[PDB]
Ligand binder design. Structure first.
Ligand SMILES: C[C@H]1O[C@@H](n2cnc3c(N)ncnc32)[C@H](O)[C@@H]1O
Ligand code: SF4
Lengths: 96, 252, 527, 192, 197
């Protein structure tokens, strides 16, 4: 149902993070798929509160996105000197 | 000038006093109380001595241990609660108007007054003695032609029962088993036995509310716990009676 | 050198631990061993501590790595850091209108001690902190909170205690100054006006979750209660020491028990929570009457206070009891006898009453005669186990001590509700508890404002139920559950149109998200 | 005392025999007891099982009287289910008694035949028993609120919501398919 | 502006010695100081966004219109660390880019930009002489109130409340050699008796 996806997104995120195989790929994919900058950040914060920030940031990398990765890396407590150059270098290169 | 100490207020004796000494054993039978009528040449107006009712507490070896507080209007009644505390007596309290009501009073082994409850008895009523249950849970007050049963869950002494007789001589409690009173009504040996009962309303699931009714002699208190879980020393919308209630029940 | 290698050892330990913990990895050998392998190259007495290494972490890393060493709820999670302060030494009020001071209070202004406040001996840690601060509230509060910060706690809810004599017997300007100073040392605001200080402390970080003011029954009239509610007081501590009027009379106590009971009623109807002091081994009492009064205390529906403090009578030099113990007129109990007495008393404590403390912590080398050891409750609980019965005290059933002492975890939480009658009012006591293991997870008292004794202009206007106390120790949506059930009770069970919670000024914002609006000194809500 | 459903009336004689009475005035000897009981209750209990017989019906009725005497022993038509009990209260589909071992004990009222119940050993941790403060006497039960109201010895009332009653409410609401009132009621009594 | 975690005790703008840009400092109760760069129009110096530069959220730039046209692009500039207690009073210098921070830990110090990495370090620190404001047995949280910082010919005078009603002076020549000059005193409460020798 489109309406359930519109509203009950956090339920789907909880479901994806709760199943033991930990389908975080689909969760982050749908989170980024949202066309917003307000709710998407809220859901990222919710996920980092729920699931460990380091694993979710690694999954964000594995999702092939840097903007989402940079958004998450602001919740990981790592020194920004230790990831900002990395994310910049990832950003200014070819897809492959 | 504000002060800590309390005024003296020497005691005295009543009119319907019985001038016989009385003796009570405490449950552990290590001290006993002896009550008498005595006159003292008190420092307060020593020209004429004052006659009153007093008592003393002695050990099992006959050794005198403690005196009693001088209370204005004690009577010949005296009984020791078998728990070992709160020697129970009765008092007229007949000095000032609207303060006149015969009340059962309590004492400690020191003979220092500690707590009481106002029997709802008429002022002029004659009270023969008082008694305590075997387990100290119920207190029986004996009069000319009626006996009263009292209990206490939260220091609010209820008047649970009133047995009506013709001519009462003496009243005793069964020692090994409580709630078994015996007495001599006009030359007849009468035995009565009691048992706690919850005056419950219907518990049938359709329209039930645990409408527990508690008797307080002239009062019948209600408590529909499903509506307002009022703790026992208060109650929810009690109702009254002309006399002394024996037992109550609730309609479906 | 001697100590420089210690500083640089702590430094490398901090940097390495931060580097390891950034990606989520623990240590291996409890760093002190690794500390020594480098710093004790010559073994020059360099002994670090956990506090020592904690005071080395950089701020950005400290505030985020510190709580990852402590997990007891009331310690660092609930974070009600009991921060006790003291007022200037002064003579307790009754001495003037009786002739002499209480016959058992050690120390004071005119005892062998020239420095300790009344009922204190100038040797408890609080006394040395007060003197090293010269009894100034600002230094007291700042130093205590800073010592707590240094020791690695992540304190966020400071709860103040104002110990020492009767604080309520001081000139009003002095008390206003004291309270404003406390709130200012907490929040950081540097004002002088009580209204502004409260308004600032309400938004403050490191919330002032309450404040306790031990006092006397006579000095708790309507006006005094209004004063203390202006200050922000949330729990009262009242001296009783005896239900027998003769003992109070012979101890130069100066207040009748009836006065104590009336004060209890009016204060509990003012929304406060009262904790009473109950002295055993008072003169002319004996074990029989000791047990009698402690058994009546919870049986008379007039006292039945929510807290308690059992303080066995200790005789100390210089008091009014030394000139009576030396003559042999009064002899103390026996060690085994008193342990047994405490066991039997604790056996009767109802589930709602919390035993805040046992025998005073006045040092052994100073007490002439009384309690021998300093671990009375330990032996009391051992003797309780020996007798078979067990304790129902809140503090002996709350989660926090169990997780570190009993090492037992809760898994059968259930809703329990007591409903008793105390001080002329109907008091409900909600809790989420563990029936099988008798572990209390959350609690909330509640009272129906009695018509006879209530006086606040907020309460007499319309029927009101007061949420006198809400406490959650060990998902975790309990305060919400308790508050909702209390709302339901006050709407149906009580028939009260407006339910208001008394709250420490620090926590007034928490009830904001619950829909409460600030009325006077209470957080109220109509229904 | 009156019947459980109040449509009848019951009484007990000094012999120990419990008999009935109706509005018309017709009696019938309900039962007899090993000794006269100082308190009692009456119920025409029915029976049910997983797959009910007689085309899914619970009309297998039997009149029973649960009694208690001074010694402390509960009798369900001359059998001893438990000893030293303090107080009891029956209700629709339940019998409650306080075993003086500091525990409240449930007996479902869906068995015409009564047989002695197992002893409650230490740490049973079952939906039948429920731990209770020492000296507590049961006072009332409100199934419409699923609340058992006891009164401890010192005299302070105490409402508990024992596991089995709220659980039965939860089940009967799950069949009723609300999923919200059941969920609300259960989450209030923090369930699993 | 966001980036603080606690109350903001004091703040102070700096002199616009370069038109179009200057510095604003805000010191909190959390022992942090934050420097914000105010840039007026034509000097705002945004980041070219069509090519992704990957800016952090804490480096968010607040742009606003005063009337409709003075676009101000206030951006965070620096994080000053380690004051050990609150920042009771902070104040710039007349000319030099030095920031004076007076803290409540009986200490007062002076930061300046690093000539090497473009960050800020402790240029100077005073108040290490054992004292605690209204007490003196142990220091640590309970010293210095408001501070004044003014230069005579070659003398950077620091003036500070001593939590005891007495002022404290420190005169230093260039940046290092600092010595105490005479201050004043006086009671903070009422004065009762005046006994002549
Ligand atoms: C602070 C609490 O301790 C009581 N108190 C007074 N004197 C003593 C003593 N010597 N030992 C213990 N408690 C005491 C006070 O009366 C108050 O109840
Ligand atoms: S008994 Fe009370 S009033 Fe007297 S000194 Fe002790 S605390 Fe003060």
């Amino acid at each position: 149902n489109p309406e359930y996806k519109k509203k009950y997104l956090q339920t789907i995120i909880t479901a994806y993070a709760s199943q033991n195989p930990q389908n975080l790929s689909a969760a982050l994919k749908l989170i980024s798929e949202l066309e917003n900058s307000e709710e998407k950040d809220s859901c990222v914060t919710y996920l980092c509160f729920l699931q460990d920030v380091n694993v979710v940031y690694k999954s964000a990398l594995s999702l092939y996105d840097v903007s989402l990765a940079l958004l998450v890396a602001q919740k990981s407590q790592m020194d920004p000197r230790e990831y900002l150059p990395f994310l910049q270098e990832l950003q200014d290169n070819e897809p492959l | 000038d504000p002060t800590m100490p309390y005024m003296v207020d020497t005691g005295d004796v009543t009119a319907l006093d019985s001038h016989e000494i009385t003796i009570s054993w405490r449950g552990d039978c290590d001290y006993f109380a002896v009550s008498s009528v005595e006159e003292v040449p008190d420092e307060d107006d020593e020209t004429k001595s004052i006659k009153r009712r007093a008592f003393r507490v002695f050990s099992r070896e006959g050794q005198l241990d403690s005196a009693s507080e001088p209370v204005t209007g004690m009577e010949h009644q005296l009984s020791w609660k078998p728990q070992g505390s709160l020697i129970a007596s009765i008092q007229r309290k007949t000095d000032l108007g609207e303060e006149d009501s015969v009340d059962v009073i309590f004492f400690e082994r020191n003979g220092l007054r500690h707590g009481e409850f106002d029997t709802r008895l008429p002022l002029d009523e004659k009270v023969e003695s008082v008694c305590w249950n075997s387990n100290s849970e119920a207190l029986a007050v004996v009069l000319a032609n009626r006996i009263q049963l009292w209990t206490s869950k939260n220091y609010h002494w209820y008047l649970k029962q009133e047995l009506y007789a013709s001519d009462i001589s003496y009243v005793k409690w069964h020692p090994e088993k409580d709630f078994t009173l015996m007495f001599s009504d006009a030359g007849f040996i009468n035995i009565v036995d009691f048992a706690y009962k919850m005056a419950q309303g219907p518990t049938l699931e359709p329209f039930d509310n645990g409408t527990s009714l508690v008797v307080d002699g002239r009062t019948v208190n209600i408590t529909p716990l499903a509506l307002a879980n009022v703790p026992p020393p208060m109650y929810y919308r009690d109702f009254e009676t002309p006399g002394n209630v024996l037992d109550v029940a609730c309609s479906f | 050198p001697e100590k420089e290698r210690f500083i640089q050892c702590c430094a490398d330990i901090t940097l390495e631990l931060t580097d390891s913990l950034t990606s989520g990895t623990t240590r291996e050998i409890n760093l002190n061993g690794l500390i020594t392998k480098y710093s004790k190259k010559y073994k020059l007495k360099q002994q670090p501590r956990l506090t020592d290494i904690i005071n080395s972490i950089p701020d950005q890393y400290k505030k985020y790595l510190l709580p990852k060493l402590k997990a007891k709820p009331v310690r660092t999670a609930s974070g009600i850091a009991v921060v006790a302060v003291m007022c200037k030494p002064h003579r307790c009020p009754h001495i003037a209108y009786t002739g002499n001071i209480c016959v058992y209070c050690p120390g004071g202004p005119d005892s062998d001690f020239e420095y300790s406040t009344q009922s204190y001996t100038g040797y408890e840690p609080t006394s040395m902190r007060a003197i090293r601060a010269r009894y100034d509230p600002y230094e007291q509060a700042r130093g205590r909170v800073e010592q707590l910060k240094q020791l690695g706690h992540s304190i966020d809810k400071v709860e103040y205690v104002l110990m020492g004599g009767t604080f309520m017997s001081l000139p009003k300007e002095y008390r206003e100054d004291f309270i404003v100073k406390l709130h200012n040392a907490l929040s950081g605001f540097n004002g002088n006006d009580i209204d502004e200080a409260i308004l600032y402390s309400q938004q403050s970080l490191t919330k002032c979750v309450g404040i306790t003011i031990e006092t006397r029954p006579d000095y708790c009239t309507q006006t005094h209660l209004d004063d203390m509610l202006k200050y922000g007081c949330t729990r009262l501590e009242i001296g009783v020491q005896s239900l027998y009027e003769d003992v109070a009379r012979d101890t130069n106590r100066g207040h009748t028990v009836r006065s104590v009971c009336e004060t209890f009623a009016v204060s509990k109807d003012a929304g406060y929570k009262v904790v009473s002091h109950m002295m055993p081994d008072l003169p002319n009492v004996g074990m029989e009457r000791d047990i009698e009064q402690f058994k009546e205390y919870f049986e008379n529906p007039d006292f039945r206070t929510d807290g308690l403090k059992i303080y066995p009578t200790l005789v100390i030099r210089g008091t009014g009891l030394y000139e009576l113990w030396k003559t042999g007129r009064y002899k103390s109990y026996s060690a085994n006898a008193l342990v047994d007495l405490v066991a039997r008393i604790l056996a009767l404590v109802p589930p709602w009453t919390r035993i805040y403390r046992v025998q005073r912590d006045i040092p052994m080398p100073l007490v002439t005669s009384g309690v021998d050891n300093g671990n009375l409750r330990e032996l009391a609980l051992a003797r309780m186990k020996d007798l078979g019965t067990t304790c129902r005290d809140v503090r002996t059933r709350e989660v926090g001590i169990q997780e570190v002492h009993h090492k037992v975890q809760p898994d059968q939480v259930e809703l329990i509700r007591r409903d008793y009658y105390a001080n002329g009012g109907w008091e409900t006591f909600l809790s989420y508890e563990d029936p099988k293991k008798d572990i209390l997870i959350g609690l909330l008292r509640l009272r129906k404002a009695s018509k006879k004794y209530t006086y606040r202009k907020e309460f007499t206007s319309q029927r009101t139920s007061i949420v006198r106390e809400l406490h959650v120790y060990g998902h975790q949506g309990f305060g919400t559950l308790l508050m909702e059930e209390a709302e339901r009770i006050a709407k149906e069970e009580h028939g009260s149109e407006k339910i208001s919670v008394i709250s420490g000024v620090g926590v007034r914002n928490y009830y904001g998200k619950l829909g409460y609006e600030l009325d006077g000194p209470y957080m109220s809500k109509r229904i | 005392r009156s019947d459980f459903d109040y449509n009848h009336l019951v009484y007990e004689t000094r012999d120990g025999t419990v008999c009935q009475l109706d509005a018309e005035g017709q009696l019938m000897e309900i039962t007899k007891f090993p000794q006269l009981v100082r308190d009692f209750r009456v119920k025409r209990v029915h029976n049910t099982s997983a797959e009910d017989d007689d085309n899914w019906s619970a009309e297998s009725s039997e009149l029973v009287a649960f009694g208690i005497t001074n010694n402390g022993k509960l009798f369900a038509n001359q059998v001893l289910l438990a000893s030293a009990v303090t107080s009891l209260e029956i209700t629709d589909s339940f019998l409650l008694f306080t075993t003086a071992q500091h525990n409240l004990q449930f007996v479902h009222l869906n068995s015409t035949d009564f047989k002695p119940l197992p002893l409650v050993e230490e740490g049973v941790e079952d939906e039948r028993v429920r731990a209770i403060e020492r000296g507590s006497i049961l006072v009332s039960v409100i199934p419409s609120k699923s609340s058992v109201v006891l009164q401890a010895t010192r005299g302070n009332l105490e409402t508990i919501y024992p596991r089995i009653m709220v659980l039965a409410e939860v089940r009967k609401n799950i069949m009723a398919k609300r999923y919200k009132e059941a969920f609300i009621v259960c989450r209030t009594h923090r369930i699993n | 502006l966001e980036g603080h975690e606690d109350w903001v005790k004091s703040l102070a703008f700096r002199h616009q010695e370069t038109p179009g840009d200057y510095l604003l400092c805000s010191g909190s109760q959390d022992r942090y100081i934050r420097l914000w760069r105010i840039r007026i129009n034509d000097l705002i110096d945004d980041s070219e966004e069509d090519s992704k530069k990957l800016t952090l959220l804490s480096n968010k730039q607040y742009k606003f219109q005063i009337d409709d046209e003075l676009r101000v692009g206030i951006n965070f500039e620096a994080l000053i660390m380690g004051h050990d207690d609150w920042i009771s009073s902070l104040q710039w210098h007349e000319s030099r880019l030095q920031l004076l921070a007076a803290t409540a830990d009986t200490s007062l110090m002076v930061w300046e930009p690093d000539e090497t990495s473009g960050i800020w370090v402790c240029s100077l620190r005073l108040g290490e002489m054992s004292s605690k404001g209204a007490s003196t047995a142990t220091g640590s949280s309970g010293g210095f109130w408001s501070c004044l910082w003014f230069t005579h010919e070659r003398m950077d005078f620091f003036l500070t409340n001593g939590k005891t009603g007495s002022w404290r002076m420190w005169a230093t020549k260039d940046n290092i050699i600092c010595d105490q000059r005479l201050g004043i005193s006086g009671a903070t409460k009422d004065v009762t008796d005046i006994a002549w020798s």
